[PDB]
Amino acid sequence: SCASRCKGHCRARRCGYYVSVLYRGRCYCKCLRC
């Protein structure tokens, strides 16, 4: 679960918003509201 791992990374960085998308075997993650 790429998005699940990215979601924990944003929470670990003290963030309330995060984005996650998997396409063509690529992971697009983002963290905001920190």
Whether 9 contacts 27, CB under 8 Å: no
Range of the domain at 11: 2-32
Assess contact for 19 and 29: CB atoms under 8 A: yes
H/E segment holding residue 28: strand 26-32
Per-residue burial over 1-27, b = 16 or more CB atoms within 10 Å of its CB, e = otherwise: eeeeebbeebeeeeeeebebeeeeeee
Cα–Cα distance measured from residue 9 to residue 3, given in angstroms and rounded to the nearest whole number: 10
Nearest-CA neighbor of 33 among 21, 16, 8?
16
Q: How far apart are the first and last CA of the chain?
A: 23
Nearest CA-CA partner of 31 in 18, 16, 14: 18
C-alpha distances in Å from residue 19, one per residue of 13, 29:
14, 5
- β-partners of residue 28 are 21
Experimental technique, in short, is NMR
* Structural domain count of the chain: 1
Distance CA 34, CA 31 (A): 8
